[PDB]
Amino acid sequence: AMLIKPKRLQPGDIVATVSPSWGGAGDSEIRWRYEQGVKRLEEVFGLTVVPMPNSLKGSEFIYNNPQARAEDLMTAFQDTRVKAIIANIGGQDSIRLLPYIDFNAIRENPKIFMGYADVTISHLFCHKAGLSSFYGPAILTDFAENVEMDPYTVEMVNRTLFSNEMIGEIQPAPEWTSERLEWIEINKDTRRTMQQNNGYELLQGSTTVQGRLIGGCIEVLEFAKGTELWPEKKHWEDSILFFATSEDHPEPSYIKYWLRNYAAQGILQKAKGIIFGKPKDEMYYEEYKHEILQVMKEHNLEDLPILYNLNFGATEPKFILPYGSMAEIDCENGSFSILESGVE
Amino acid sequence: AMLIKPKRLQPGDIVATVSPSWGGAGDSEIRWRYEQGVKRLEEVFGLTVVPMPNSLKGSEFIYNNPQARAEDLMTAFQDTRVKAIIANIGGQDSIRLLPYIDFNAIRENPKIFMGYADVTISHLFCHKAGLSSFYGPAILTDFAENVEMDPYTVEMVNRTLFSNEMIGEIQPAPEWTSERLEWIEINKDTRRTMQQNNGYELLQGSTTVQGRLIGGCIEVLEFAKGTELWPEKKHWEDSILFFATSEDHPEPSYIKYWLRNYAAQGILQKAKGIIFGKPKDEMYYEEYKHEILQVMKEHNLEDLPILYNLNFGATEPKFILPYGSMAEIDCENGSFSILESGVE
């Protein structure tokens, strides 16, 4: 293990909320939604919540001030009362924070950091500092789910962040959604419609393999390629790669192009296995499979275990992937497991 | 300069044709078109043309055999009778040649290498071997133009490859086309419809700047990021960046994402200036401007000279960009010049 594992949460602990990507949480029309997410952190999980100073200043300010976003992250990491940091939401431009990050401030202050999609970039800040962080739910999208949180997401927060017991097998969720229901307050009493989930699909592979988790949102990872933010070679050795596609539904050819580059980098050849998240709206569900299998065939990797349709990524509900934690793909059983705790 | 300038081509010289990307030149219904391009190399330029051994075996063979494509390149470079190499056409997967390239073989046999789009990858092979190669016309798309070659493309081939006089100012073409007229022989006597061209547009900048050319097809450059094929740091210092979009019309948001990555790499900050090629069909002409200007604004680069709508890239006709040559953007006059010869 190359990464520091942070301490577990308990009720009473303080969690900081931050806006490293899109600044919407503070927009007048969305603030109710932020407050609803916070309410679940407080009431369901028993946590105390503090927003970082610039995090609710709204989307115009946040967009224009990447340094202030970075300052919010540094403030949260440097405050010893803060036991976890959760992103409000993704976006697309948190790569702009790079000039303003003090990696040693993260290194000297290990704690839980969680979010997904563009927050992939903020995960790479933690990763560079040697801290295991959590590809997982965010305030506006998951904790603020209308009417009630999904019990699957709640279970997985408990198992990953509140317990130092081995996480173990990740069962698929019974149902999923990515229905568009605008974040208008008079919609708050409306449940989003759920779809039956049918569980994991094995695209290829015939072995049980284990390796340490690395990855994120595949579109956003492109943003960091060739930069000083990209994880050094040792982190890719004997990995389990995890990829999710985001809400803009990247055309299938891009999934091919991006995987071809992972091959050209030597990353696919170093992987023990790959897991893919359910695409948003299941758009391109079958088409992505075709591209994935083609790139593997092109590079003599037809036996690399690849599991598909997991509940992480752009749909709800979600489980949580701790970076660098040992994980397992069991092809014969079509199962995915995390073979250690997420927290200490 | 870090790149070797190859020797001047002249009538009577031998040129090799290669298929490093899509292998369609040898397909039964396309072969007439390859032969039409060969006829202009022979009759207009006075050259003897030799296809490399695997280059006309068709698209199925070529796709399945990246190693044979790489061998064709090596064959052409190692034959001292061959004075220039021209790609038949682009494609999308020449990144697959990477593990099969003998860079020493290129370094020891400097000579003209020319093509565009996916052939960007093959340029990067030359670049890594320390050879200046030519972002420029290809057999099937330019030399094989129905009825006759465009005099603009002819002129720029002559000025860049057939003379060691300074290239000088690159004037805009009077007309352009990217009309889809299928490469079916029954069409061979049909001229493509031309559009009036309005010349270069200065997007920003108020100075005259000089720097060495580096760039290529912006979609394809993504394929090489974070790989050992990416040009080393010194190549990006005091550059003039050149970017063209390809036939797939990348959505404007991707231009933004890709340019934010150039910023995150420290590349935009080191540029003296940037030039963009006319988009295919002028699709997203205005949208791309908006994205380019937004990324400059995001990174305090609003005084960086940027010229738009140049005749390189996905449309016809084309001028030629020698990698690493000293070039000039003059903002007050809205002009672009290359301040050395393309060849020795």
Coordinates of C-alpha atoms in Angstrom, one line a residue, chain A:
Chain A
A1 CA 0.0 0.0 0.0
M2 CA 1.4 3.3 -1.1
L3 CA -1.3 5.6 0.2
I4 CA -2.2 6.8 3.7
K5 CA -5.6 5.5 4.9
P6 CA -7.5 8.2 6.9
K7 CA -9.4 7.7 10.2
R8 CA -13.0 6.6 10.3
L9 CA -15.9 9.0 11.0
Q10 CA -18.3 8.8 13.9
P11 CA -21.4 11.0 14.8
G12 CA -20.3 14.3 16.1
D13 CA -17.3 14.6 13.7
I14 CA -17.1 17.8 11.7
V15 CA -17.3 17.5 7.9
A16 CA -16.3 20.4 5.6
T17 CA -18.2 21.0 2.3
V18 CA -16.3 22.5 -0.6
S19 CA -16.9 23.6 -4.2
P20 CA -13.7 22.8 -6.2
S21 CA -15.6 22.4 -9.5
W22 CA -18.9 24.0 -10.3
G23 CA -19.9 26.8 -7.9
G24 CA -23.7 26.2 -8.0
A25 CA -24.3 25.2 -4.4
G26 CA -24.5 28.8 -3.4
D27 CA -26.6 30.0 -6.3
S28 CA -29.9 31.5 -4.9
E29 CA -32.0 28.9 -6.7
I30 CA -29.9 25.9 -5.6
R31 CA -29.1 26.8 -2.0
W32 CA -32.2 24.9 -0.7
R33 CA -30.7 21.8 -2.3
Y34 CA -27.3 22.3 -0.6
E35 CA -29.2 22.7 2.7
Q36 CA -31.1 19.5 2.1
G37 CA -27.9 17.5 1.5
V38 CA -26.4 19.0 4.7
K39 CA -29.6 18.0 6.6
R40 CA -29.0 14.4 5.8
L41 CA -25.4 14.6 6.8
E42 CA -26.6 16.0 10.1
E43 CA -29.7 13.9 10.8
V44 CA -29.0 10.6 9.0
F45 CA -25.3 10.3 9.8
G46 CA -25.1 12.5 12.9
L47 CA -22.3 14.7 11.6
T48 CA -21.6 18.4 12.1
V49 CA -21.2 20.3 8.8
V50 CA -19.2 23.5 8.1
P51 CA -18.9 25.1 4.6
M52 CA -15.5 26.4 3.6
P53 CA -15.4 30.2 3.3
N54 CA -15.6 30.6 -0.5
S55 CA -17.7 27.5 -1.2
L56 CA -21.1 29.1 -1.2
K57 CA -20.3 32.3 -3.1
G58 CA -22.0 31.1 -6.2
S59 CA -21.1 29.9 -9.7
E60 CA -19.8 33.2 -11.1
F61 CA -17.4 33.9 -8.2
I62 CA -16.2 30.3 -8.0
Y63 CA -15.6 30.1 -11.8
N64 CA -13.6 33.3 -11.8
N65 CA -11.6 32.3 -8.7
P66 CA -9.8 29.0 -8.9
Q67 CA -7.3 30.2 -6.3
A68 CA -10.2 30.7 -3.8
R69 CA -11.4 27.1 -4.5
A70 CA -7.9 25.9 -3.8
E71 CA -7.8 28.0 -0.6
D72 CA -11.0 26.3 0.6
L73 CA -9.4 22.9 0.1
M74 CA -6.3 24.0 2.0
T75 CA -8.3 25.5 4.8
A76 CA -10.2 22.2 5.2
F77 CA -7.1 20.1 5.2
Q78 CA -5.2 22.3 7.6
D79 CA -8.1 22.5 10.2
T80 CA -7.5 19.7 12.6
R81 CA -11.1 19.7 13.7
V82 CA -12.2 18.7 10.2
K83 CA -12.4 14.9 9.9
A84 CA -13.8 14.7 6.4
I85 CA -14.2 16.8 3.3
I86 CA -17.1 16.3 0.8
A87 CA -17.4 18.0 -2.5
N88 CA -20.7 19.6 -3.2
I89 CA -20.7 18.6 -6.9
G90 CA -18.6 18.1 -10.0
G91 CA -18.2 20.4 -13.0
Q92 CA -15.4 20.6 -15.5
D93 CA -12.6 23.1 -14.6
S94 CA -11.1 22.1 -11.3
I95 CA -7.8 21.4 -13.3
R96 CA -7.4 25.2 -12.9
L97 CA -6.7 24.8 -9.2
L98 CA -3.3 23.2 -10.0
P99 CA -1.2 26.4 -9.6
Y100 CA -2.6 27.0 -6.1
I101 CA -2.3 23.6 -4.4
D102 CA 0.1 23.0 -1.5
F103 CA 0.5 19.2 -1.7
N104 CA 2.3 19.1 1.6
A105 CA -0.7 20.6 3.4
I106 CA -2.6 17.5 2.3
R107 CA 0.2 15.2 3.1
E108 CA 0.5 16.5 6.7
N109 CA -3.2 16.4 7.3
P110 CA -4.7 13.0 6.2
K111 CA -8.4 12.8 6.4
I112 CA -11.4 11.7 4.3
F113 CA -11.9 13.4 1.0
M114 CA -14.9 12.4 -1.2
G115 CA -16.7 13.2 -4.5
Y116 CA -16.8 12.1 -8.1
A117 CA -16.8 13.1 -11.8
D118 CA -14.7 16.4 -12.2
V119 CA -13.7 15.9 -8.5
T120 CA -11.4 13.2 -10.0
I121 CA -8.9 16.1 -10.3
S122 CA -9.1 16.8 -6.6
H123 CA -8.6 13.1 -6.0
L124 CA -5.4 13.4 -7.9
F125 CA -4.3 16.2 -5.6
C126 CA -4.8 13.8 -2.7
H127 CA -3.2 11.0 -4.6
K128 CA -0.1 13.1 -5.4
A129 CA 0.2 13.9 -1.7
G130 CA 0.1 10.2 -0.8
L131 CA -3.4 10.2 0.7
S132 CA -6.1 7.6 -0.2
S133 CA -9.3 9.5 -1.1
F134 CA -12.8 8.3 -2.0
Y135 CA -14.5 8.1 -5.3
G136 CA -18.1 8.5 -4.0
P137 CA -21.2 10.5 -3.4
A138 CA -21.4 14.3 -3.3
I139 CA -23.7 16.7 -1.5
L140 CA -26.0 18.0 -4.2
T141 CA -26.4 14.7 -6.1
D142 CA -26.5 12.0 -3.5
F143 CA -26.9 13.3 0.1
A144 CA -29.6 15.7 -1.2
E145 CA -31.7 13.1 -3.0
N146 CA -35.4 14.2 -2.9
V147 CA -37.6 12.7 -0.1
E148 CA -34.9 10.3 1.2
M149 CA -31.4 9.1 0.5
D150 CA -31.1 5.7 -1.3
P151 CA -30.5 3.0 1.3
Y152 CA -27.8 1.6 -0.9
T153 CA -25.7 4.8 -0.8
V154 CA -26.3 5.1 2.9
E155 CA -25.1 1.5 3.5
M156 CA -22.0 2.1 1.5
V157 CA -21.1 5.3 3.3
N158 CA -21.5 3.3 6.6
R159 CA -19.3 0.4 5.3
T160 CA -16.6 2.6 3.8
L161 CA -16.2 5.6 6.1
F162 CA -17.7 4.7 9.5
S163 CA -16.3 1.2 10.0
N164 CA -12.7 -0.1 10.0
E165 CA -13.9 -3.6 9.1
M166 CA -13.0 -5.1 5.7
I167 CA -15.5 -3.7 3.2
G168 CA -15.9 -7.1 1.4
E169 CA -18.1 -7.9 -1.5
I170 CA -19.9 -5.1 -3.3
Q171 CA -23.4 -6.4 -4.2
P172 CA -25.2 -4.6 -7.0
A173 CA -27.9 -2.2 -6.2
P174 CA -31.5 -3.4 -6.8
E175 CA -32.5 -0.3 -8.7
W176 CA -30.9 2.8 -10.3
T177 CA -31.8 6.2 -11.7
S178 CA -30.5 9.1 -13.6
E179 CA -33.8 10.9 -14.2
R180 CA -33.6 14.6 -14.7
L181 CA -35.6 16.4 -12.1
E182 CA -34.6 20.0 -11.8
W183 CA -33.3 21.3 -8.5
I184 CA -36.3 23.6 -8.1
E185 CA -37.4 23.7 -4.4
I186 CA -41.1 23.0 -5.3
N187 CA -39.9 19.7 -6.7
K188 CA -38.4 18.5 -3.3
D189 CA -41.5 16.3 -2.5
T190 CA -41.1 14.4 -5.8
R191 CA -39.2 11.1 -5.8
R192 CA -37.2 10.3 -8.9
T193 CA -38.4 7.3 -10.8
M194 CA -36.3 4.2 -10.4
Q195 CA -35.4 1.5 -12.9
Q196 CA -34.7 -2.2 -12.2
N197 CA -30.9 -2.9 -12.0
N198 CA -29.8 -6.3 -13.3
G199 CA -26.3 -6.5 -11.8
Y200 CA -22.8 -6.9 -13.2
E201 CA -21.8 -8.2 -16.6
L202 CA -18.5 -9.9 -17.3
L203 CA -17.1 -8.7 -20.6
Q204 CA -14.1 -10.9 -20.7
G205 CA -11.7 -12.8 -18.3
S206 CA -11.7 -16.2 -16.7
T207 CA -9.6 -15.7 -13.5
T208 CA -9.8 -14.2 -10.0
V209 CA -7.5 -11.3 -9.7
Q210 CA -6.7 -8.7 -7.1
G211 CA -5.0 -5.3 -7.3
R212 CA -5.1 -1.8 -6.0
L213 CA -7.7 0.6 -7.2
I214 CA -6.9 3.6 -9.5
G215 CA -9.0 5.5 -12.0
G216 CA -11.9 7.9 -11.9
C217 CA -14.1 9.6 -14.5
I218 CA -12.5 8.6 -17.8
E219 CA -13.3 12.0 -19.5
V220 CA -11.8 13.9 -16.6
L221 CA -8.7 11.8 -16.3
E222 CA -7.8 13.0 -19.9
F223 CA -7.6 16.5 -18.4
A224 CA -4.6 15.4 -16.3
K225 CA -2.7 13.4 -18.8
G226 CA 0.8 14.7 -19.5
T227 CA 0.6 17.0 -16.4
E228 CA 2.5 17.0 -13.2
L229 CA -0.8 15.8 -11.6
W230 CA -0.6 12.4 -13.4
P231 CA 0.2 9.5 -10.9
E232 CA 3.7 8.2 -11.2
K233 CA 4.5 4.8 -12.7
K234 CA 4.5 2.7 -9.5
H235 CA 0.8 3.5 -8.9
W236 CA -0.2 1.7 -12.1
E237 CA 1.6 -1.6 -11.4
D238 CA -0.8 -4.5 -10.8
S239 CA -3.8 -2.2 -10.6
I240 CA -7.5 -2.6 -10.8
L241 CA -8.5 0.2 -13.0
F242 CA -11.9 1.9 -12.4
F243 CA -13.6 4.0 -15.1
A244 CA -16.9 5.8 -15.2
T245 CA -18.4 7.9 -18.0
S246 CA -20.1 11.2 -17.1
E247 CA -23.3 13.0 -17.8
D248 CA -22.3 14.3 -21.2
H249 CA -22.5 10.8 -22.6
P250 CA -19.1 10.7 -24.5
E251 CA -19.5 9.2 -28.0
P252 CA -18.2 5.6 -28.1
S253 CA -15.3 6.4 -30.4
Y254 CA -13.8 8.5 -27.6
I255 CA -13.9 5.6 -25.2
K256 CA -11.9 3.7 -27.9
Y257 CA -9.4 6.7 -28.3
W258 CA -8.9 7.1 -24.6
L259 CA -8.3 3.3 -24.0
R260 CA -5.9 3.3 -26.9
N261 CA -3.9 5.9 -25.1
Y262 CA -3.9 3.9 -21.8
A263 CA -2.5 1.1 -24.0
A264 CA 0.2 3.4 -25.5
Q265 CA 1.1 4.5 -21.9
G266 CA 1.6 0.9 -20.8
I267 CA -1.2 1.2 -18.3
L268 CA -3.5 -1.5 -19.7
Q269 CA -0.6 -4.0 -19.8
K270 CA 0.1 -3.4 -16.1
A271 CA -3.5 -3.8 -15.0
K272 CA -4.8 -6.9 -13.2
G273 CA -8.4 -6.0 -14.2
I274 CA -10.8 -3.2 -15.0
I275 CA -14.3 -2.2 -13.7
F276 CA -16.7 0.1 -15.5
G277 CA -19.5 2.1 -14.0
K278 CA -23.1 2.1 -15.4
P279 CA -23.3 4.9 -18.1
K280 CA -25.7 7.7 -17.5
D281 CA -29.1 6.8 -18.7
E282 CA -27.5 3.6 -19.9
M283 CA -26.7 5.6 -23.1
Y284 CA -24.2 3.7 -25.2
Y285 CA -24.5 0.7 -22.9
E286 CA -23.9 -1.9 -25.6
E287 CA -21.7 0.4 -27.8
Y288 CA -19.1 1.0 -25.2
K289 CA -18.7 -2.7 -24.7
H290 CA -17.8 -3.0 -28.4
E291 CA -15.1 -0.4 -28.1
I292 CA -13.7 -1.8 -24.9
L293 CA -13.4 -5.3 -26.4
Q294 CA -11.9 -4.0 -29.6
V295 CA -9.1 -2.1 -27.8
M296 CA -8.3 -5.2 -25.7
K297 CA -8.1 -7.3 -28.9
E298 CA -5.9 -4.8 -30.5
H299 CA -3.3 -5.0 -27.7
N300 CA -3.4 -8.7 -26.9
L301 CA -5.3 -8.3 -23.7
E302 CA -8.4 -10.5 -24.4
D303 CA -7.9 -12.3 -21.0
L304 CA -7.8 -9.2 -18.9
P305 CA -10.8 -9.4 -16.5
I306 CA -13.3 -6.7 -17.2
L307 CA -16.5 -6.1 -15.2
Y308 CA -19.3 -3.8 -16.4
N309 CA -22.4 -2.2 -15.1
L310 CA -21.3 -1.5 -11.6
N311 CA -23.1 1.1 -9.4
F312 CA -20.5 3.8 -9.4
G313 CA -20.2 6.8 -11.8
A314 CA -22.9 9.1 -13.1
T315 CA -26.0 7.2 -11.9
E316 CA -27.6 6.8 -8.5
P317 CA -27.2 5.0 -6.2
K318 CA -23.5 4.5 -5.6
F319 CA -20.9 2.6 -3.7
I320 CA -17.5 4.0 -2.8
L321 CA -14.1 3.3 -4.3
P322 CA -11.1 4.1 -2.0
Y323 CA -8.0 4.9 -4.1
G324 CA -5.2 2.4 -3.7
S325 CA -7.3 -0.1 -1.7
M326 CA -6.9 -3.8 -2.6
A327 CA -9.8 -5.0 -4.7
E328 CA -10.9 -8.3 -6.4
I329 CA -12.6 -9.3 -9.6
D330 CA -13.9 -12.9 -9.5
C331 CA -14.8 -13.8 -13.1
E332 CA -16.3 -17.2 -12.3
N333 CA -18.7 -15.6 -9.8
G334 CA -19.0 -12.3 -11.6
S335 CA -18.3 -10.5 -8.3
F336 CA -16.4 -7.4 -7.1
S337 CA -14.9 -7.0 -3.6
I338 CA -12.8 -4.6 -1.7
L339 CA -10.4 -6.6 0.4
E340 CA -9.7 -4.1 3.2
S341 CA -11.3 -1.3 5.1
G342 CA -11.7 2.1 3.6
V343 CA -10.7 3.8 6.8
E344 CA -8.7 3.1 10.0

